[PDB]
Amino acid sequence: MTEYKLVVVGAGGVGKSALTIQLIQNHFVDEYDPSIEDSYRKQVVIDGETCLLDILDTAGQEEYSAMRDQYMRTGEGFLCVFAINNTKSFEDIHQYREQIKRVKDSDDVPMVLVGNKCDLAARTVESRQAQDLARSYGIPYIETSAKTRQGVEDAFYTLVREIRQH
Ligand SMILES: Nc1nc2c(ncn2[C@@H]2O[C@H](COP(=O)(O)OP(=O)(O)NP(=O)(O)O)[C@@H](O)[C@H]2O)c(=O)[nH]1
Ligand SMILES: [Mg+2]
Incomplete structure (x- = not known):
């Protein structure tokens, strides 16, 4: 099987853990609310290929993490997550992009822009605004x-496909 190192990043409270947990849960534990950053694994078939996804659920840029630079060096692809009801989180996306570019010294890092909490009616970030931002990054x-x-x-499997076509 093929192993992929994915890193989930974004401002505090946008849903980095919730997304990661929803993907990787085997549901033995009813509720799992991780308090700090951690690594998770998921085996899945994507386009006929058996994949092992190593998923790193990071803390927001706000919190200190000693290993953050090495997380970014190791990471092959990045989910850049914001919340559609949190303008600040959307504006913060630039910070996360620049951090990844600074560490990896590259303009062509596999990423997916993720607008989370789309179940909510109190939207402050329009889809077209985020589509525009994604198109400017070429992601x-x-x-x-x-x-x-x-x-x-879809968000995770799209990221795997971005890594592949890199
Ligand atoms: N309505 C809604 N709430 C969500 C969604 N994803 C996460 N949340 C909620 O938003 C809050 C933050 O979720 P969490 O997964 O902790 O986000 P985080 O980005 O990991 N936070 P932290 O940076 O502190 O680790 C929680 O109350 C969670 O239940 C979503 O898609 N919809
Ligand atoms: Mg979290």
Whole structure:
């Protein structure tokens, strides 16, 4: 099987853990609310290929993590997550992009822009605004809800496909 190192990044509270947990849960534990950053694994078939996804659920840029630079060096692809009801989180996307570019010294890193919490009516970031931002980075944009599961598998599998076509 092929192993992929994925890193989930974004501002505090956008749903980085919720997304990761929704993908990787085997549901033995009913509720799991991770308090700090951690690594998770998921085996899945994507376009006929058996993949092992190593998924790193990072803390926001706000919190200190000693290993952050090495997480980014190791990471092969990045989910850049914001929340559609949090303008600040959307504006923060630039910070996360620049951090990844600074560490990896590259303009062509596999990424997916993720607008999470799309189950919510109180939207402050229009899809067209995020599509515009994604198009300026030359990356896919996908809207997700970690509550409903909408788009969650698609976001991760799109990232794997970006890594592949790199
Ligand atoms: N309505 C809604 N709430 C969501 C969604 N995803 C996460 N949340 C909620 O938003 C809050 C933050 O979720 P969490 O997964 O902790 O986000 P985080 O980005 O990992 N936070 P941290 O940076 O502190 O680790 C929680 O109350 C969670 O239930 C979603 O898709 N929809
Ligand atoms: Mg978290």
